[PDB]
Amino acid sequence: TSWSDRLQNAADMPANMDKHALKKYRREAYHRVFVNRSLAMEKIKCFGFNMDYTLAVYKSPEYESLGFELTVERLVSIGYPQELLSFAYDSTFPTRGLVFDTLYGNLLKVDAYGNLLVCAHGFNFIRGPETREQYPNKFIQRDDTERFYILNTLFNLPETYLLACLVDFFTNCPRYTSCETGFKDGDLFMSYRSMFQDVRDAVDWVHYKGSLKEKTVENLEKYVVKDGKLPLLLSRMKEVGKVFLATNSDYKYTDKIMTYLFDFPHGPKPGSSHRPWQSYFDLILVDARKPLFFGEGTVLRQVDTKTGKLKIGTYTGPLQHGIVYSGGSSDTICDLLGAKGKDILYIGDHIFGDILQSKKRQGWRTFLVIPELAQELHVWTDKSSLFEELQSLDIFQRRIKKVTHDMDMCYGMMGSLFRSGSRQTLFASQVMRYADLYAASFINLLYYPFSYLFRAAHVLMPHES
Amino acid sequence: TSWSDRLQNAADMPANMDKHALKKYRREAYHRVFVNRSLAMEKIKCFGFNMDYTLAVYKSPEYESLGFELTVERLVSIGYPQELLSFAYDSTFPTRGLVFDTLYGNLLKVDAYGNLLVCAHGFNFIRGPETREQYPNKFIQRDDTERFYILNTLFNLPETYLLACLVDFFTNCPRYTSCETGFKDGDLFMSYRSMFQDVRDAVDWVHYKGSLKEKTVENLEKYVVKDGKLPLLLSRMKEVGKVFLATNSDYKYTDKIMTYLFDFPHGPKPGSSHRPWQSYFDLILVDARKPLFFGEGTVLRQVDTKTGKLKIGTYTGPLQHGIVYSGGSSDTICDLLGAKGKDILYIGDHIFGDILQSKKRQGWRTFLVIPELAQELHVWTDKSSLFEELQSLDIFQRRIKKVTHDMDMCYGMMGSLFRSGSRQTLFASQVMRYADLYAASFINLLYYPFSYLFRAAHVLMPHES
Amino acid sequence: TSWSDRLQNAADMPANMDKHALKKYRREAYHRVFVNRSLAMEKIKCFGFNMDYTLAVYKSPEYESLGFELTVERLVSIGYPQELLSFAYDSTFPTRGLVFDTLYGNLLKVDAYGNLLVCAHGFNFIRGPETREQYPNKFIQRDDTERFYILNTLFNLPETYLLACLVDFFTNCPRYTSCETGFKDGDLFMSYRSMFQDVRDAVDWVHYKGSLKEKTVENLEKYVVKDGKLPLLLSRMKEVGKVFLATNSDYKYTDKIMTYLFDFPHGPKPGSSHRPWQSYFDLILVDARKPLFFGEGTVLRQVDTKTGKLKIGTYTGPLQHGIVYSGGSSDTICDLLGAKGKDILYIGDHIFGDILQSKKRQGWRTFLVIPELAQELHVWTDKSSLFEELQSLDIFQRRIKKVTHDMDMCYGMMGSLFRSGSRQTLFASQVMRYADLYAASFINLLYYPFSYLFRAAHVLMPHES
Amino acid sequence: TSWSDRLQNAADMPANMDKHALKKYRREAYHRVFVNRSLAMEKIKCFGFNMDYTLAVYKSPEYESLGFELTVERLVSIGYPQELLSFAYDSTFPTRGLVFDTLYGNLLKVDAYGNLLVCAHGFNFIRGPETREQYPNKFIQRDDTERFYILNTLFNLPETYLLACLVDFFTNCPRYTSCETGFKDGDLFMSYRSMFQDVRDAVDWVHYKGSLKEKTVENLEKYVVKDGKLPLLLSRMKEVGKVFLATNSDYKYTDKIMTYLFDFPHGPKPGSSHRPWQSYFDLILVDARKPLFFGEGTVLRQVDTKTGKLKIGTYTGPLQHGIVYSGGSSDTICDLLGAKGKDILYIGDHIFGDILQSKKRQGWRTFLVIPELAQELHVWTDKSSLFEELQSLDIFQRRIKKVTHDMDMCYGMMGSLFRSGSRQTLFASQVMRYADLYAASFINLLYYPFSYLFRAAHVLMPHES
């Protein structure tokens, strides 16, 4: 059972909007909104969305496997060895948020301070003492972006596995000689850094010049979660505020996906007339180029929605019914909707480019969709005895590592998104710091009343306690 | 009673090293070490120090007032009006960590997310609704370093007050016309930005080309806290590890200050022979140029300690008894002392240039000295009823603001370093995030045994609770 | 008669290698090498070439017209108005080296000091007094690369004409309103700057993602000059030195073009066995990425000449017979051929990226191919009476402008590549400064003996005369 | 006889303003203006000046020797060895425009293309074959400003000699070991680069924080050329146009120097009332910060001429009689004087920061003062037989080098400013390219009528001849 199986199972349920049913439903962890900082929903005047992995949640592992297969085929196309074709995507290996070290070719799981929690070279998981040869302080400088790449998005899951497949393949292929920083093949040297850049380039190519989007839209039931409660929630948001879309994707793709997401024989509720997806939005903006969007952005363009091409020129007019924008900046949204940052609840899947910049640069309120939480919550509640024992051992050595390994393996080979044993990951720290609210799906807002006050306990410093 | 009065009062007490006396002493908040992240003291192999406001704690308000007076005299010297000479330093106005907005000439107290807690134009404290004209989202982008300057150090306290004095003076002087971004005087326009840069330049000048250091060292009893327990603690650190000094100050000043700090008729304990201050350090490094020090640093030089000048050339030799270094980088310390970052407890007063970079760039463990905590703890414990009522009101509007104001004014006109009412400051958030340990004085380590385990409770995410 | 008609006419002639025939042939201006700085051919140990417009001279106006047509079709494809399709390339309008001013939408012909010689807005040629409204000093700052783009290459000829066509079209189309910096269409504003960037992007697209290369190689007799004397000259160069190719083009295109250039039923001389084009080169390097090539360059790769793809890895081996390189830097050439810069005569068409950087960064000797000189020499010699009269008028006002216009129009609407009347262009100054030798074709070297000393008179300063 | 002896000798002569006397006087090379590009004086509407080495020509070698002595004393003060005090300035060694190579510690004389003409390590002049070990192509990349420093100004003459003294001293001092890139002294390594930066820092310090200006103004007759014809020329310029001063120096120094330059018992002519120096200028601007001045510059300030300090604020008013400006940009001059660039003849001594940027960035007309030409012209005319023989040998090997050495030594150990033998220097090329007019003194303009047309012959390309 993948996290998207859980989401689709919940998506198939119709919405019982009786008040008591809702309050009972929201008490379950799976349908709850989690609160890092208090948020008064009645102060929210605008709801903003990205599309990918927020409105359009791609099914797992089918979508990762398609991305992986096309990326592999691209690498072979540009001259990587034929043996790459025998790879097959394995969802049990990657956890999101790992760091690829382009110097030594390792995947690292780190805490918020760059301390190493897990280190794997290919499929070989390196134990602590052996990690000290390459990481003398068991520490990396995350901000050294020339050396380290953080595989932060769900789109990075296939390449997370592919990097490990490639390091494993070249390590064990007798044509190559393993070196500290790459692989020797006579008079050719492939550094881990150049191999990584080839992988990154191929993933970009598959998304923007290859066939990934085409294959997705030709079988949307296979690749995209669909929930009849989505138009219901959006319709309820539009009753109390304004609703906008700000997506990095282009209009043609956005139109295909959003049309599928709204393709029911009804509108917001069963029995109601169907409405086009655009009618749910006060403002639609594509080609957003986030995170630059939250700074100076790009020039504001208008989409010709008949042709899918941009009209000629910078758009200087006002907000008009039916207009679709391209580029611009977050100030475009605020100006046209008459919003201030703290009036906006912005809902995204990208802990950096959506959530981090919108919070740090503009003071928007933030809702982070974490799709994998739909399954991680089940592992967390079912194996609570493991974690409880771990807490007891901490309060009370080899037992601690054994329980830590057993707990971590329930989530996969790279453990929970949020921790390794008792130590929290970088990703966990960033969620807590930048996501005011978070949940496995933004649909969980449907189960809270219009003016709900989401509450978090006040933080005190140690000397204040 | 200033915070340095509290520190000097504690400094005058002799050290009772009976174990039971120590455990009783450390339980009082004033002599305690506070813990943000657990730290096993037995894993610490090196203790590192900055000098200013750590080893050499300058007395308050005498030192701020000297800095203020000399800065004012410098501004008048370069042509500011004579009326500046009637200013006098007022310690009740500034709190550390305020942000000067060079566009609108305001001092701002902000939370960790850039939300406005306090806004003062000169000495006029602007209430919420009126702040929205200049801050529509009641929010600033802290990283806009061209516009905002964070007055983060204790050396910034005089200029924090001076900026408010200047805005007040020009606002109410009939020769000038107040504009949104500065002051008009016929055909001259002084922007708040240019006024701020003049102030910054004058503070730098007083420290590095004026008479501040000379006046300090000619009356060290007036200006510098002195504690006979300092050589005792340093001697105990050297028993279990190595000890280093890494200061931005030059050697001549460092020698004068450190000689005063160790000028007792005894060594570590009463009855023991006096030892020179340099003998307490395995490595002494001046002109450190932090924060650049924690990156590539500068070339390593050797100080001629006879003349106080740098020897000619880059120093290429090994660690030698009696050598004094200049410049270099944090890798110099690690290499020469044979330390890894997590072996080092680095003790500083600078939440950014000491603590933040040493943690983020090198993985050092950190101890933050917060001198004002010596007095803030007394206000916190004496007015706990105010804060407790505030918590109750929050859980249960105009009453909340009234109690918030009354609580804040106990600390001064700009409130507590750590909060305004129930809302934590940026500074508080940075302390929690980057200081593993913190205290009003590093001397509080004297009251914990050699292998003490400082403990902090594990953090859980909302969905993990 | 175009300049490529002249070159092809000379190309069709067989090489008479009798010494007296050669010395007689080289005395004609059309077959001469022109000398800016003295160059002893016997000191030249390596001959280097770019390919495009040097070895492969594209026929005019057929090739410009193809580039123009495909660029126009690309612009219409992305949404420019259908009327663009009625444009047709006109070789009489553009002269190479004009500057597009993206602020005001003008094409400028300038001298070496940025002084304006010609200013055209669309097809309207602006006279001096009217140019002062937009250019008060009749001067531009060439180095303001954000505002000015110098259309320096022969590949820029179609877009030089296209920019003028577009400014003319939008100016006279009643749907648009002409503004100082662009065109208004209701709520859309197309600045000249954004229009220019669309044009630049479309030209790049046609060359690298569109059909330009495909259409070229499917009719090479239509598009590429072919000269049986080319293998003869290259074979003679290889007798006395080494020969290399360093091209920005990729291997597949290079192979197609070079195979055509050598496709004769003979080798160097008639009667000799045909040899593959690669056998004429000691070193072949593609994807050169000049001008970066003459600095740090890029990593050295090896081409798999069977597949046309790059082999995997950085190439670390030595120079080998049959190997083809990709990327690298100019130091690669010098190292592998054992050459110093002044040993190399580098032959190119690009006054900046070939010639300027190779001279300024590496001290190479330079030969500039100027294809248009093949026709400009005929205009210069046939209308020498116009220029002679102009010189006399200068030595001796409205007559001077009238003769200047009449002389300039013999070359086209934008005048000679090298001057407007008595004033030299920027391009002329750059040729004199950076091209040691220059000619309409590098084939003219065939008519000089192996050890010829090309001589230029010494320069004296005014006070030295 | 130094060049300033020649200038002072000419300065002592009174001005005979009879027309025939002037035309006879200007025909002598020493009182002539030399012309690189034609310039119609009647089109000049503004005359602009820098002060140092233009209006205020410092006497040689007295001023260089003072600069040298104070720089040496500063280096010893910061810890260089006492033996530096035995150095004494030697005017026969340095020629202006040499390049210090901070990698290998050499002074280089180069041509316009970076080719090596002379190479000296300390006082050892390295012959061609031995230069190839460090300069394999006998070539340097001038634009590598991290490695090469061009000693372009007359203020650089003392440090040109000092660098050679230092390399010589450390090379031959037995305490140090000579290495390729510097000097070893046990555990200290002084690279040539760090030694150079110490020298540069000390020269800056002497000018801006040391006693150079004080010693200059306390004996201006010793250090500054004085010419009663200066107010006559400036008065004649003001009759036909506007006159401005734009100096990098501060007001207090400018006032002292300019007061001395005008201290005669008469005004423009003998018998006329004396006028203050400021009355000769329509605009006076100090602290110009050229070359940045010719770009965005700095904020415009007003000088309080009573106190010599800047008034508070940016100056926003108009041009007023008696006002003195500070900072600003070249656009300040053009705006306030109502000038376009080609209306301005700007007169300076700095081939880069005055002349180059004013020409390249603004299109000003330029007059370059070359003080050493006052003596170089005498060497050139007296040894014309050497150069004539050299030309004949070139047209017609070991003889050529022998005559080249003999000719070069007449100018000093580093030869003529303008050439080594038949090869022109970089400086010569820059003069020809950026100085429209040039002369040993700008006073030579006095001998040409108000509307004189300075003529240079038109340049033709090789194919145009």
mmCIF file of N, CA, C and O in Angstrom, chain C residues 410-463:
data_model
loop_
_atom_site.group_PDB
_atom_site.id
_atom_site.type_symbol
_atom_site.label_atom_id
_atom_site.label_comp_id
_atom_site.label_asym_id
_atom_site.label_seq_id
_atom_site.Cartn_x
_atom_site.Cartn_y
_atom_site.Cartn_z
ATOM 1 N N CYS C 410 26.687 52.821 -53.012
ATOM 2 C CA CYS C 410 27.251 51.793 -53.880
ATOM 3 C C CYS C 410 27.405 50.461 -53.159
ATOM 4 O O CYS C 410 27.402 49.402 -53.801
ATOM 5 N N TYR C 411 27.555 50.488 -51.833
ATOM 6 C CA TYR C 411 27.708 49.274 -51.038
ATOM 7 C C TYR C 411 26.392 48.691 -50.546
ATOM 8 O O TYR C 411 26.372 47.541 -50.096
ATOM 9 N N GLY C 412 25.311 49.457 -50.587
ATOM 10 C CA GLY C 412 24.052 49.076 -49.982
ATOM 11 C C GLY C 412 23.519 50.192 -49.116
ATOM 12 O O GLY C 412 24.147 51.230 -48.935
ATOM 13 N N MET C 413 22.325 49.953 -48.559
ATOM 14 C CA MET C 413 21.632 50.997 -47.803
ATOM 15 C C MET C 413 22.357 51.356 -46.518
ATOM 16 O O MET C 413 22.200 52.477 -46.014
ATOM 17 N N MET C 414 23.150 50.434 -45.985
ATOM 18 C CA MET C 414 23.913 50.693 -44.772
ATOM 19 C C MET C 414 25.398 50.864 -45.056
ATOM 20 O O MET C 414 26.215 50.797 -44.134
ATOM 21 N N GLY C 415 25.760 51.071 -46.316
ATOM 22 C CA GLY C 415 27.111 51.469 -46.652
ATOM 23 C C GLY C 415 28.141 50.358 -46.520
ATOM 24 O O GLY C 415 27.836 49.183 -46.313
ATOM 25 N N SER C 416 29.401 50.769 -46.656
ATOM 26 C CA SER C 416 30.508 49.834 -46.573
ATOM 27 C C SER C 416 30.637 49.269 -45.163
ATOM 28 O O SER C 416 30.383 49.950 -44.160
ATOM 29 N N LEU C 417 31.065 48.014 -45.101
ATOM 30 C CA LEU C 417 31.454 47.404 -43.841
ATOM 31 C C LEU C 417 32.494 48.246 -43.097
ATOM 32 O O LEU C 417 32.511 48.260 -41.862
ATOM 33 N N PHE C 418 33.334 48.982 -43.831
ATOM 34 C CA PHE C 418 34.551 49.576 -43.277
ATOM 35 C C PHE C 418 34.472 51.073 -43.032
ATOM 36 O O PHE C 418 35.343 51.610 -42.340
ATOM 37 N N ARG C 419 33.481 51.765 -43.583
ATOM 38 C CA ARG C 419 33.447 53.207 -43.421
ATOM 39 C C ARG C 419 32.087 53.735 -43.851
ATOM 40 O O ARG C 419 31.328 53.067 -44.566
ATOM 41 N N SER C 420 31.795 54.947 -43.398
ATOM 42 C CA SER C 420 30.776 55.794 -44.005
ATOM 43 C C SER C 420 31.496 57.058 -44.457
ATOM 44 O O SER C 420 31.980 57.825 -43.619
ATOM 45 N N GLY C 421 31.584 57.261 -45.768
ATOM 46 C CA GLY C 421 32.376 58.372 -46.271
ATOM 47 C C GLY C 421 33.800 58.272 -45.759
ATOM 48 O O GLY C 421 34.438 57.217 -45.826
ATOM 49 N N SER C 422 34.306 59.368 -45.210
ATOM 50 C CA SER C 422 35.683 59.375 -44.744
ATOM 51 C C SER C 422 35.847 58.837 -43.325
ATOM 52 O O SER C 422 36.970 58.838 -42.812
ATOM 53 N N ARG C 423 34.780 58.382 -42.671
ATOM 54 C CA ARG C 423 34.861 57.960 -41.274
ATOM 55 C C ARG C 423 34.848 56.440 -41.164
ATOM 56 O O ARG C 423 33.934 55.787 -41.674
ATOM 57 N N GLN C 424 35.846 55.883 -40.477
ATOM 58 C CA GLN C 424 35.956 54.434 -40.372
ATOM 59 C C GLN C 424 34.979 53.876 -39.346
ATOM 60 O O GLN C 424 34.719 54.501 -38.316
ATOM 61 N N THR C 425 34.460 52.677 -39.621
ATOM 62 C CA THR C 425 33.547 52.019 -38.692
ATOM 63 C C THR C 425 34.302 51.367 -37.532
ATOM 64 O O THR C 425 35.511 51.127 -37.591
ATOM 65 N N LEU C 426 33.536 51.042 -36.488
ATOM 66 C CA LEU C 426 34.017 50.180 -35.411
ATOM 67 C C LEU C 426 34.636 48.901 -35.955
ATOM 68 O O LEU C 426 35.733 48.502 -35.540
ATOM 69 N N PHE C 427 33.930 48.231 -36.875
ATOM 70 C CA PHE C 427 34.428 46.978 -37.430
ATOM 71 C C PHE C 427 35.801 47.168 -38.062
ATOM 72 O O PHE C 427 36.723 46.387 -37.813
ATOM 73 N N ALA C 428 35.958 48.216 -38.871
ATOM 74 C CA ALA C 428 37.251 48.510 -39.481
ATOM 75 C C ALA C 428 38.341 48.639 -38.425
ATOM 76 O O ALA C 428 39.441 48.091 -38.581
ATOM 77 N N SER C 429 38.052 49.383 -37.352
ATOM 78 C CA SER C 429 39.034 49.576 -36.289
ATOM 79 C C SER C 429 39.392 48.256 -35.632
ATOM 80 O O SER C 429 40.556 48.012 -35.313
ATOM 81 N N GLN C 430 38.398 47.398 -35.407
ATOM 82 C CA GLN C 430 38.673 46.105 -34.788
ATOM 83 C C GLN C 430 39.485 45.199 -35.705
ATOM 84 O O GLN C 430 40.373 44.478 -35.235
ATOM 85 N N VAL C 431 39.178 45.193 -37.009
ATOM 86 C CA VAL C 431 40.011 44.449 -37.957
ATOM 87 C C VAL C 431 41.459 44.906 -37.857
ATOM 88 O O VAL C 431 42.380 44.094 -37.698
ATOM 89 N N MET C 432 41.685 46.215 -37.956
ATOM 90 C CA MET C 432 43.060 46.697 -37.919
ATOM 91 C C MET C 432 43.748 46.316 -36.615
ATOM 92 O O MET C 432 44.940 45.991 -36.620
ATOM 93 N N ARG C 433 43.007 46.309 -35.504
ATOM 94 C CA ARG C 433 43.636 46.126 -34.198
ATOM 95 C C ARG C 433 43.912 44.665 -33.880
ATOM 96 O O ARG C 433 44.917 44.354 -33.225
ATOM 97 N N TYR C 434 43.046 43.749 -34.321
ATOM 98 C CA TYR C 434 43.142 42.379 -33.851
ATOM 99 C C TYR C 434 43.473 41.360 -34.926
ATOM 100 O O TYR C 434 43.890 40.252 -34.577
ATOM 101 N N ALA C 435 43.324 41.697 -36.204
ATOM 102 C CA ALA C 435 43.638 40.777 -37.291
ATOM 103 C C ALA C 435 45.030 41.109 -37.816
ATOM 104 O O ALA C 435 45.228 42.157 -38.430
ATOM 105 N N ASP C 436 45.994 40.215 -37.588
ATOM 106 C CA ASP C 436 47.332 40.465 -38.121
ATOM 107 C C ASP C 436 47.311 40.478 -39.638
ATOM 108 O O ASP C 436 47.927 41.349 -40.267
ATOM 109 N N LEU C 437 46.612 39.512 -40.232
ATOM 110 C CA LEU C 437 46.381 39.413 -41.666
ATOM 111 C C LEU C 437 44.877 39.343 -41.905
ATOM 112 O O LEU C 437 44.111 38.937 -41.024
ATOM 113 N N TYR C 438 44.442 39.742 -43.104
ATOM 114 C CA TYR C 438 43.039 39.574 -43.459
ATOM 115 C C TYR C 438 42.895 39.507 -44.972
ATOM 116 O O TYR C 438 43.768 39.956 -45.720
ATOM 117 N N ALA C 439 41.785 38.912 -45.410
ATOM 118 C CA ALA C 439 41.548 38.685 -46.835
ATOM 119 C C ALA C 439 40.110 38.234 -47.037
ATOM 120 O O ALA C 439 39.412 37.877 -46.083
ATOM 121 N N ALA C 440 39.662 38.266 -48.298
ATOM 122 C CA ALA C 440 38.312 37.786 -48.568
ATOM 123 C C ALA C 440 38.207 36.280 -48.373
ATOM 124 O O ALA C 440 37.116 35.771 -48.091
ATOM 125 N N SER C 441 39.324 35.571 -48.486
ATOM 126 C CA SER C 441 39.347 34.126 -48.317
ATOM 127 C C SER C 441 40.713 33.720 -47.791
ATOM 128 O O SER C 441 41.727 34.301 -48.175
ATOM 129 N N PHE C 442 40.752 32.697 -46.936
ATOM 130 C CA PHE C 442 42.084 32.248 -46.546
ATOM 131 C C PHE C 442 42.801 31.532 -47.683
ATOM 132 O O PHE C 442 44.013 31.302 -47.585
ATOM 133 N N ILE C 443 42.090 31.183 -48.757
ATOM 134 C CA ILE C 443 42.743 30.509 -49.882
ATOM 135 C C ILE C 443 43.843 31.379 -50.472
ATOM 136 O O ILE C 443 44.760 30.865 -51.118
ATOM 137 N N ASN C 444 43.797 32.695 -50.239
ATOM 138 C CA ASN C 444 44.812 33.567 -50.814
ATOM 139 C C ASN C 444 46.211 33.266 -50.286
ATOM 140 O O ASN C 444 47.195 33.626 -50.945
ATOM 141 N N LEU C 445 46.331 32.570 -49.145
ATOM 142 C CA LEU C 445 47.645 32.137 -48.681
ATOM 143 C C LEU C 445 48.315 31.189 -49.675
ATOM 144 O O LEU C 445 49.543 31.065 -49.679
ATOM 145 N N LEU C 446 47.529 30.518 -50.509
ATOM 146 C CA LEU C 446 48.101 29.598 -51.489
ATOM 147 C C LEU C 446 49.071 30.288 -52.444
ATOM 148 O O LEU C 446 49.962 29.626 -52.994
ATOM 149 N N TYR C 447 48.932 31.597 -52.644
ATOM 150 C CA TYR C 447 49.691 32.312 -53.664
ATOM 151 C C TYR C 447 50.951 32.951 -53.113
ATOM 152 O O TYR C 447 51.626 33.688 -53.839
ATOM 153 N N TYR C 448 51.294 32.672 -51.864
ATOM 154 C CA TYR C 448 52.509 33.147 -51.242
ATOM 155 C C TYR C 448 53.403 31.970 -50.893
ATOM 156 O O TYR C 448 52.902 30.915 -50.488
ATOM 157 N N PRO C 449 54.715 32.113 -51.049
ATOM 158 C CA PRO C 449 55.623 30.989 -50.788
ATOM 159 C C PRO C 449 55.650 30.621 -49.314
ATOM 160 O O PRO C 449 55.167 31.349 -48.445
ATOM 161 N N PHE C 450 56.280 29.472 -49.046
ATOM 162 C CA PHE C 450 56.248 28.876 -47.712
ATOM 163 C C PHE C 450 56.779 29.829 -46.641
ATOM 164 O O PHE C 450 56.255 29.866 -45.521
ATOM 165 N N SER C 451 57.818 30.601 -46.957
ATOM 166 C CA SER C 451 58.504 31.427 -45.970
ATOM 167 C C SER C 451 58.318 32.920 -46.225
ATOM 168 O O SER C 451 59.187 33.727 -45.880
ATOM 169 N N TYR C 452 57.194 33.300 -46.831
ATOM 170 C CA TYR C 452 56.950 34.699 -47.149
ATOM 171 C C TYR C 452 56.919 35.539 -45.880
ATOM 172 O O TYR C 452 56.411 35.108 -44.840
ATOM 173 N N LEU C 453 57.469 36.745 -45.971
ATOM 174 C CA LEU C 453 57.406 37.718 -44.882
ATOM 175 C C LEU C 453 56.353 38.757 -45.251
ATOM 176 O O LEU C 453 56.578 39.609 -46.118
ATOM 177 N N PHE C 454 55.191 38.672 -44.606
ATOM 178 C CA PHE C 454 54.185 39.713 -44.746
ATOM 179 C C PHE C 454 54.633 40.946 -43.967
ATOM 180 O O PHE C 454 54.971 40.848 -42.785
ATOM 181 N N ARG C 455 54.652 42.100 -44.628
ATOM 182 C CA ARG C 455 55.199 43.315 -44.037
ATOM 183 C C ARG C 455 54.141 44.402 -43.907
ATOM 184 O O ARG C 455 53.349 44.635 -44.824
ATOM 185 N N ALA C 456 54.140 45.063 -42.753
ATOM 186 C CA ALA C 456 53.388 46.288 -42.534
ATOM 187 C C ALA C 456 54.363 47.364 -42.079
ATOM 188 O O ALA C 456 55.352 47.067 -41.398
ATOM 189 N N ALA C 457 54.095 48.609 -42.468
ATOM 190 C CA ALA C 457 54.953 49.710 -42.047
ATOM 191 C C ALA C 457 54.817 49.948 -40.549
ATOM 192 O O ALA C 457 53.738 49.789 -39.967
ATOM 193 N N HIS C 458 55.935 50.327 -39.933
ATOM 194 C CA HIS C 458 55.947 50.666 -38.518
ATOM 195 C C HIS C 458 55.096 51.899 -38.241
ATOM 196 O O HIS C 458 55.067 52.852 -39.027
ATOM 197 N N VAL C 459 54.414 51.873 -37.113
ATOM 198 C CA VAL C 459 53.617 52.995 -36.635
ATOM 199 C C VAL C 459 54.524 53.943 -35.860
ATOM 200 O O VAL C 459 55.358 53.512 -35.053
ATOM 201 N N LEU C 460 54.384 55.236 -36.121
ATOM 202 C CA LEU C 460 55.032 56.257 -35.309
ATOM 203 C C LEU C 460 53.974 57.125 -34.651
ATOM 204 O O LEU C 460 52.897 57.355 -35.207
ATOM 205 N N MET C 461 54.296 57.623 -33.461
ATOM 206 C CA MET C 461 53.423 58.584 -32.826
ATOM 207 C C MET C 461 53.579 59.949 -33.492
ATOM 208 O O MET C 461 54.572 60.213 -34.177
ATOM 209 N N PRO C 462 52.607 60.836 -33.303
ATOM 210 C CA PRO C 462 52.732 62.182 -33.877
ATOM 211 C C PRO C 462 54.010 62.907 -33.492
ATOM 212 O O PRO C 462 54.618 63.539 -34.366
ATOM 213 N N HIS C 463 54.467 62.817 -32.234
ATOM 214 C CA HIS C 463 55.682 63.542 -31.872
ATOM 215 C C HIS C 463 56.940 62.890 -32.433
ATOM 216 O O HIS C 463 57.991 63.542 -32.475
#
